[PDB]
Write a protein that binds this DNA or RNA. Structure first.
Ligand SMILES: [Mg+2]
Ligand SMILES: [Zn+2]
Ligand SMILES: [Zn+2]
Ligand SMILES: [Zn+2]
Lengths: 143, 203, 86, 110, 212, 56, 427, 280, 205
DNA sequence: CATGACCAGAGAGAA
DNA sequence: TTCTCTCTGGTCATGAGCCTCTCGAT
RNA sequence: AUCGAGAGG
């Protein structure tokens, strides 16, 4: 059946441009991670992760989705577990898991030790501060 | 004024005459207020209640400045000292107090948004100007402003001047509360945001 | 400090359940149910853990308790049972 | 996966910043970084006791360390130290240093 | 041709009367709106000149003010015809205020004040003396559109405020001690004032600020 | 991502071709156009974070 | 269909992007901001075309705000701490009497305004009234003081006029010309100089870029040769790698330097030829950059200027960052290449130009100034005849057709440019 | 352009395109239009970055502000920023621009609209609007409650005329009464002919009870009770103007059941409209 | 005692003193003998933060995970710099070196420690590394948009993400999103097996 | 690129 | 004379939309 | 990796 509207119809020079889907499409579940930060590599060609940028952190905050936010930042990227001393709250503790022995040289502490889950980038950050002479101490309880 | 040439003749009672001339030309005020370099008469079609009660348009003459001296202009006869207004909300803070500040700050933000035909709900800009004014005076949203507060340490360094904040934290031996959200996202912990503003336990 | 509680008689927070605590309640229960933990409602042909949690919530058989914190450090405990959902 | 640990897992609720005492960096360092070279001497297939070998962490992905015996996935790097022959400033504190030197008397300590 | 100065002096007088009446002092309303001719009658001399050491007057608390603060009392306001108040002109004033055991003295001046005088302002520990400028007081800033009602809180009102919001002193919003309205009511550090403000959302909204 | 509306939870519909597909009346919150625009998808891995998407 | 214009470096095709700069040896007057102590400035960035292309910058500052009195004029000279007042320069160049100085600055005795503006400078240097004491006033750490000043005056002061001694007259007259246009601006007679006129802009092309790089590395090779000579005191050891590897590194990376990261701040000077379509290649071969900055709200350099008509394309420029800073040459647009001015100068001298030493302002008042590459070479009366002759010569071919010639009638100026790097178009 | 003589302030000389895109621009119009379009593009290209940085600073400066379980608006260190969110404790969603009808209009129209004098045969509720219509004349004990209602309406109008000085009536407010009234009219198929069965007491005492049940804060002390009444003042103005006796009986024709349903609806919607603690 | 008007120069401090320079040992042993009360009124804490610890006595080495390598990090470049400068000062100590060769050793040891902590500083000692590249300092490493805080903590690349070109569809529901089959096979949800799903889960496997 | 606080100088009142 | 007072140019210094891609020298 | 360049919304 005819269209009630008549139609503008004729030849017109068109151009096919460099951007085509199959060169852009990208998807990744638990691929390879970087050496330094231990977070996903950058680039579709290296099977990389997309960036959860801090603007998107903002959006997830405004939504109130706290645990999805912590999920993106920890389990989907460079979660890590370190052992820290219960008095000098620093990642100094020598922990052998096979033999169940945790120690803190200098402090002489072997019984007040904790383990905690932080990003590996965060473990980095604190090690870099220590190399910078600043002592980032982390304590389990308020005091 | 009748004579068609307007002349003033001044003798002292020769180079210092040039200094008297410079003083005269530059630093004598004939009239007016110290910073008001221009003034214009406009008409505003303000609406006001009629004696019958319904509102009506009662246009009024208003003068618009090209400069600001709030203190001295406000103390002038013939004007309404309760209705004076400037778009320099910081002068308002200095003369009429912090709360008048807040009100004018909101008015100017509201005007920059509504200028473009946009509308944003009162509470959002209200919160903005409340946080800017909740301290003594006017705190800006840039590195000199909110970011030199007592806002923990790690949250502070997540905006600007990162490593200097960290160094000052080392030196002053700051203790971080770890209730800021940026703190918890840094430690990969659940921040006290809507889902984590409370604990769950069983019956 | 030491036992910063509040008596249930003197409670001033909303008697209604906030959307965020409903979301966390449903998520926690759907987690508990995704692991094979006992369901305390007759799942009438329903298999999704989340919808199991939602139906458990409508019949108020979810036995958790919210601990609402007020900024000084005090808290009010609120059973999911007494909370209004709307 | 990062095996199981007897250590209790709690959360971080306080971060107390401060600065490193010499005594504590002595007391935390498991190695004297004496020699600058990374690799062991004679350009061998090894890491020298001088800087980057001694039980700071493995580099060949082989489960050896200072009382860790953990792979690189599980080993947090262990810190070391170097004794400087004579004290030297900290950049970020120069300003602060001068300011505190700005006005405190050289002789009396107040 | 300086009835300009006359009118401005008279307006500063009206506003200082309004200030101490608003501070909780016994000033009549018929008293404050003294028309200009009556002001000329009382305080302009035979030269038509106004001499403003006669203007100075002693204000006494209302009954409600001793109900809510027993220790408010004995305020006497002094105008100065000596422009550019020097340190020993304030000498004059400060030992006047000390000799009569006055809790608070307000010292309006003209045009200028030496800093050497400024340092001796908190000379007497119990007495408090506040310095003003006529050009400021020619207009009552608190009459202005954008300035809502500040009400000084009693000590127990502030304790109740803190308990019922379970607050710390530092958690409360702040008002600058030299804030114009904080000065207009003689706010002292730590004193809280409650501000009642018109509201686009709720009509009436009450905020609170503490003096810093 | 300037909005809370810049990040919204959707129901998956697996479909043949190579593009992400969405309804026209959701372009405005995203400021989306179909002129070469790209968009990003994130998948929850927990039960409660699934819930957080679906309920907030 | 290939058009050439590119290089092949380690196999990849590489293009040189025309670097746009501001022309040297042209004098511009700039008003100063509202709180500045100084009111206006006359600036020349003096460049020596042949030789070491170092750039000196001479400022003539008019001190005093627009309503202030005691308004003095001082100049900045390349190796002395303080600005020194202009009359002290003048007397150090051998022009002693106040009247002669003003004659060098003011070219009409009936301009009482300009002379009234100059009065405070005559008062400023009244203390210094012979040439030798003027040369003495110089900031060094006694006779060597005078010698240092004498050297500076011909060495670093107005280097583009000449660096040979004995032409104090040309530099005095030119300093006076700069002062004249400064005062013209300060009297609200001429407007501020527009820094975004395209005519005052230059396009460094492949030739000049390669020449600047080649000078640097050839002198490195020369220094190496000299060092090998000294080493062999008693006993052809030329390193061709220096020139070859240097040229190749520049053309390859695009960082126009000898292995310097930030020192050769101009980077991306050499880029891979775009080969996506024919037109993409064609366009990439006519791209210009302007490095003045990469980031900021640079309103005025980014806007299409009136003078861009006919030389740069109105429509074709990137969007976003680098919009307006990246330009594309119009179809018939061309770029000058460089021509010896010396024949032009000789012809001018042969056809009426009186030299600047023999110029006597009050004796030939209505006399057109003649500039050639920003150098004031002399004066000409009857400029209509000379201009007709010059144009007929250029159109005949006897003057290079890329040389440009402008007769500003209402300011009595004639400016000839034999420059390299100015965009022109046929008509 | 070099195609113009000097000192030419003409329209076409200085950039007036008298041609349309349909007819086509001349070369000078083309170039001048290009000059304008370039300014457009650069304004675009840098406003983008300036607003990106502005948004970043806004967010990082406000990021920690959240509604707490006492509805105070605080930050990381607990410092109060607002004592109640948005000065009314309402979520910014489910808030609609409804008009306050006691602002504006003549006092003549005002009193025609809300005044009922049971002591005036001409200004009382006609028996066409009420089952108790003809018992109601005289009856000073019902006129006392009606006088109380009218006096509150008057106090409200002056309060609202001194809040919104311009006389603006339409403001964003939490419960759309207009639609609840239309919902009532439709649910109960009100026929606008038979008189209601509401007692004047029904309407009056019910509206006052409803104002009592509009909680935003719940502590039982005078500070927070006054905070509560401050929060609902504007809305209660809207409510009184909307649920005034002559309005309910003569503009709406609400039966008693429909009116009670309106009351329960307003309460339900209102308490829904409060912000949730934890809101960021 | 009269005390000097102090001023900056490079990275050492000099005072007019109504003349000389102030050793690191100098200021530091002034800093040991300060009473505790003036620490604390000066904003310092007796346990964590004492001004004597602003000076650096002996420097903590970070482990390889901070400075990993086919290549070699700039941080270990600069650490080897610091160490050989330090052992050179030790040698010049042991060999009774001249009066102002010790100042070269000292001044550059401090230059090296300074540049290892933070490289961008006024006076423009750029401190370029191998291949004429400026040494990346720890400060510059954790500073900036792409720095550690803003780049790996406040935001990061994440797993279970996808991205591609979008187009519209008249026939999807507004809350829906079209997932290409390739993406939908690339991303996975972890599902604990239960009686309610075990059959469809076995089918999926 | 470009907008702007901190000293450090030196002119500048009072007792 | 002292002391507190204003009180401005040379500085050094900050960030500067998000992603996203691809390429190309060291 | 690092530096840089081009491009896309
Ligand atoms: Mg688009
Ligand atoms: Zn320890
Ligand atoms: Zn280990
Ligand atoms: Zn001492």
């Amino acid at each position: 059946k005819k269209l009630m509207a008549q139609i503008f119809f004729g030849p017109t020079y068109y151009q096919r441009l460099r951007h085509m889907v199959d060169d852009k499409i990208h998807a990744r579940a638990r691929g390879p991670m970087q050496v330094l930060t231990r977070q996903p590599v950058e680039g579709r060609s290296r099977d990389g992760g997309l960036r959860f940028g801090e603007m998107e952190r903002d959006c997830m905050i405004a939504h109130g989705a706290a645990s999805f936010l912590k999920e993106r930042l920890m389990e989907a990227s460079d979660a890590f577990r370190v052992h820290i001393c219960g008095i000098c709250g620093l990642m100094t503790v020598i922990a052998k898991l096979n033999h169940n022995q945790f120690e803190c040289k200098g402090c002489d502490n072997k019984i007040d030790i904790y383990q905690i889950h932080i990003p590996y980038a965060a473990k980095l950050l604190f090690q870099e501060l220590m190399a910078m002479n600043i002592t980032p101490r982390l304590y389990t309880d308020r005091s | 004024d009748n004579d068609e040439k307007l002349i003033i003749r001044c003798r002292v009672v020769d180079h210092m005459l040039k200094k008297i001339e410079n003083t005269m030309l530059e630093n004598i005020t004939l009239r007016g207020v110290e910073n008001i370099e221009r003034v214009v008469m406009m008409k505003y079609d303000r609406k006001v209640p009629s004696p019958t009660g319904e509102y009506v348009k009662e246009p009024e003459w208003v003068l618009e400045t090209d400069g600001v001296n709030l203190s001295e202009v406000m103390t002038v006869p013939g004007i309404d000292p309760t209705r004076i207004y400037t778009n320099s909300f910081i002068d308002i803070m200095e003369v009429l107090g912090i709360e008048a500040g807040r009100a004018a700050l909101y008015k100017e933000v509201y005007n920059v948004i509504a200028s473009d035909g946009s509308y944003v709900n009162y509470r959002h800009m209200a919160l903005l100007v409340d946080v800017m004014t909740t301290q003594g005076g006017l705190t800006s949203v840039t590195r000199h402003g909110f970011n030199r507060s007592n806002t923990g340490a790690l949250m502070r360094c997540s905006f600007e001047e990162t490593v200097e904040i960290l160094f000052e934290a080392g030196a002053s031996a700051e203790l971080d509360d770890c209730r800021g959200v940026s703190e918890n996202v840094i430690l990969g912990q659940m921040a006290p945001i809507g889902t984590g503003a409370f604990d769950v336990m069983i019956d | 400090l030491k036992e910063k509680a509040i008596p249930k008689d003197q409670r001033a927070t909303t008697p209604y359940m906030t959307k965020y605590e409903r979301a966390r309640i449903l998520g926690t229960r759907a987690l508990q149910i995704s692991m094979n933990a006992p369901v305390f409602v007759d799942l009438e042909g329903e298999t999704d853990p989340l919808r199991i949690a939602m139906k458990e919530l409508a019949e108020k058989k979810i036995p958790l308790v919210i601990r609402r914190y007020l900024p000084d450090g005090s808290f009010e405990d609120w059973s999911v049972e007494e909370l209004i959902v709307d | 996966g990062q095996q199981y640990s007897s250590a209790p897992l709690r959360t971080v609720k306080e971060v107390q910043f401060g600065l490193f005492s010499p005594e504590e960096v002595r007391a935390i360092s498991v190695a004297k970084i004496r020699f600058p070279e990374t690799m062991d001497e004679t350009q061998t297939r090894a890491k020298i006791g001088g800087l980057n070998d001694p039980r700071l962490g493995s580099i060949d992905r082989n489960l050896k360390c200072q009382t860790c015996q953990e792979g690189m996935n599980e080993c947090p790097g262990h810190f070391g130290h170097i004794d400087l022959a004579k004290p030297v400033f900290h950049v970020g504190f120069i300003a602060k240093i001068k300011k505190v030197c700005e006005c405190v008397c050289m002789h009396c300590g107040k | 041709e300086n009835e300009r100065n006359i009118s401005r002096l008279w307006r500063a007088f009206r506003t200082v009367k309004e200030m101490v009446k608003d501070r909780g002092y016994f000033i009549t309303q018929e008293e404050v709106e003294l028309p200009l001719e009556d002001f000329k009658a009382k305080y302009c001399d035979s030269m038509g000149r106004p001499q403003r050491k006669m203007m100075s007057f002693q204000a006494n608390p209302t009954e409600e003010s001793i109900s809510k603060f027993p220790d408010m009392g004995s305020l006497w306001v002094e105008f100065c015809d000596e422009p550019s108040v020097g340190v020993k002109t304030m000498k004059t004033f400060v030992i006047h205020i000390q000799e009569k055991n006055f809790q608070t003295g307000i010292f309006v001046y003209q045009n200028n004040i030496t800093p050497s005088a400024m340092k001796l302002v908190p000379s007497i520990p119990p007495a408090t003396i506040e310095t003003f400028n006529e050009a400021a007081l020619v207009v009552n800033i608190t009459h202005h559109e954008l300035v809502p009602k500040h009400i000084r809180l009693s000590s127990d009102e502030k304790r109740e405020l803190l308990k019922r919001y379970r607050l710390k002193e530092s958690q409360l919003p702040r008002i600058q001690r030299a804030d114009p309205v904080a000065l207009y009511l003689g706010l002292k550090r730590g004193e809280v004032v409650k501000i009642i403000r018109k509201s686009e959302t709720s009509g009436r909204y009450a905020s609170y600020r503490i003096c810093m | 991502s300037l909005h809370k509306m810049s990040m919204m939870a959707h129901r998956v519909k697996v479909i043949p071709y190579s593009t992400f597909r969405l309804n026209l009346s959701v372009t405005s919150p995203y400021n989306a156009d179909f002129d070469g625009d790209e968009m990003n998808l994130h998948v929850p891995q927990s039960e409660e974070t699934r819930a957080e998407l679906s309920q907030l | 269909f290939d058009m050439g214009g590119y290089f092949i470096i380690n196999g990849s095709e590489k293009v040189l992007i025309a670097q746009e700069r501001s022309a040297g040896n042209i004098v511009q007057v700039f008003k100063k901001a509202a709180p500045s102590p100084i009111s206006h400035v006359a600036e020349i960035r003096s460049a020596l075309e042949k030789g070491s292309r170092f750039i000196s910058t001479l400022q003539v500052k008019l001190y005093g705000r627009e309503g202030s009195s005691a308004r003095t004029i001082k100049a900045t000279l390349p190796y002395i701490k303080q600005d020194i007042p202009i009359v002290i320069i003048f007397r150090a160049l051998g022009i002693i009497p106040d009247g002669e100085i003003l004659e060098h600055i003011c070219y009409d005795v009936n301009d009482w305004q300009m002379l009234e503006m100059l009065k405070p400078c005559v008062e400023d240097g009244f203390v210094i009234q012979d040439r030798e004491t003027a040369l003495d006033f110089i900031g060094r750490r006694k006779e060597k003081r005078i010698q240092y000043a004498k050297d500076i005056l011909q060495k670093e002061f107005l280097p583009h006029i000449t660096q040979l001694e004995g032409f104090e007259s040309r530099k005095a007259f030119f300093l006076g010309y700069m002062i004249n246009r400064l005062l013209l601006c300060a009297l609200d007679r001429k407007d501020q100089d527009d820094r975004d006129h395209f005519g005052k802009k230059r396009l460094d092309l492949a030739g000049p870029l390669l020449a600047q790089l080649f000078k640097t590395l050839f002198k490195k090779l020369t220094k190496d040769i000299f060092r090998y000579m000294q080493r062999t005191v008693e006993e052809l050891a030329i390193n061709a790698k220096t020139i070859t590897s240097g040229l190749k590194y520049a053309l390859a990376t695009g960082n126009w330097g000898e292995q310097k990261k930030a020192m050769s701040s101009r980077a991306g000077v050499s880029q891979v030829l775009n080969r996506y379509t024919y037109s993409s290649t064609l366009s990439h071969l006519r791209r210009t950059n302007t490095p003045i900055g990469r980031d900021g709200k640079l309103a005025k350099p980014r806007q299409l200027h009136n003078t861009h008509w006919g030389l740069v394309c109105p429509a074709e420029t990137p969007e976003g960052q680098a919009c307006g800073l990246v330009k594309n040459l119009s179809l018939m647009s061309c770029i000058s290449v460089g021509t010896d001015p010396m024949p032009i100068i000789t012809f001018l001298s042969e056809w009426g130009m009186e030299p600047l030493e023999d110029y006597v302002p009050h004796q030939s008042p209505d006399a057109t100034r003649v500039f050639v590459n920003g150098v004031w070479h002399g004066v000409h009366r009857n400029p209509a005849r000379l201009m007709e002759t010059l144009r007929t010569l250029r159109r005949k071919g006897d003057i290079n057709p890329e040389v440009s010639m402008i007769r500003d009638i209402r300011e009595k100026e004639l400016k000839i440019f034999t420059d390299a790097g100015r965009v022109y178009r046929p008509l | 352009l070099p195609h113009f003589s000097k000192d030419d302030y003409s329209p076409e000389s200085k950039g007036f395109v008298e041609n349309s895109y349909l007819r086509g621009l001349t070369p000078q119009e083309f170039f001048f239009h290009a000059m304008g379009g370039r300014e457009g593009l650069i304004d675009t290209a840098v406003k983008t970055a300036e607003t990106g940085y502005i948004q970043r600073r806004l967010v990082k400066a406000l990021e920690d502000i959240m509604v707490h379980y006492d509805n105070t608006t605080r930050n990381s260190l607990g410092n109060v920023i607002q004592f109640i969110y948005g000065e009314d404790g309402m979520d910014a969603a489910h808030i609609e621009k409804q008009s306050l009808d006691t602002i504006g209009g003549s006092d003549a129209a005002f009193e025609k609209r809300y005044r009922v004098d049971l002591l005036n045969t001409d200004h009382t509720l006609d028996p066409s609007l009420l089952e108790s219509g003809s018992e109601i004349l005289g009856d000073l004990k019902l006129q006392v409650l009606l006088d109380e209602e009218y006096k509150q309406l008057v106090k409200d109008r002056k309060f609202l005329r001194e809040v919104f000085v311009d006389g603006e009536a339409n403001w964003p407010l939490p419960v759309n009464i207009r639609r609840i009234i239309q919902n009532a009219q439709q649910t109960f198929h009100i026929d606008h002919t038979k008189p209601s069965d509401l007692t004047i007491k029904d309407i009056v005492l019910g509206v006052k009870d409803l104002q009592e049940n509009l909680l935003v804060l719940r502590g039982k002390n005078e500070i927070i009770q006054n905070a509560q009444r401050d929060a609902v003042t504007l809305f209660c103005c809207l409510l009184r103007s909307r649920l005034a006796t002559r309005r309910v009986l003569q503009e709406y024709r609400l039966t008693k059941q429909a009116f009670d349903w309106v009351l329960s609806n307003i309460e339900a919607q209102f308490l829904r409209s409060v912000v949730h603690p934890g809101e960021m | 005692n009269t005390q000097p008007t102090i001023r900056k120069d490079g990275l050492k401090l000099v005072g007019s003193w109504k003349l000389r320079v102030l050793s690191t040992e100098e200021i530091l042993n002034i800093f040991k003998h300060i009473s505790v009360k003036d620490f604390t009124s000066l904003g310092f804490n007796e346990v964590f933060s004492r001004p004597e610890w602003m000076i650096l006595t002996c420097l903590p080495v970070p482990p390889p995970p901070v400075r990993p390598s086919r290549g070699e990090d700039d941080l270990t470049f600069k650490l080897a710099d610091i160490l050989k400068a330090n052992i050179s000062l030790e040698t010049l100590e042991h060999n009774g070196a001249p009066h102002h060769a010790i100042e070269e050793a000292e001044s550059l040891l401090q230059f090296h420690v300074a540049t290892y902590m933070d490289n961008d500083i006024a006076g423009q000692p750029q401190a370029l590394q191998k291949s004429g590249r400026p040494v990346k300092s720890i400060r510059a490493r954790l500073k900036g948009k792409e720095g550690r805080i803003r780049g790996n903590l406040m935001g990061k690349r994440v797993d279970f993400s996808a991205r591609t070109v979008i187009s519209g569809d008249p026939n999807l529901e507004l809350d829906q999103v079209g997932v290409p089959k390739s993406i939908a096979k690339t991303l996975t949800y972890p599902e604990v097996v239960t009686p309610y799903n075990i059959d469809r889960l076995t089918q999926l496997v």
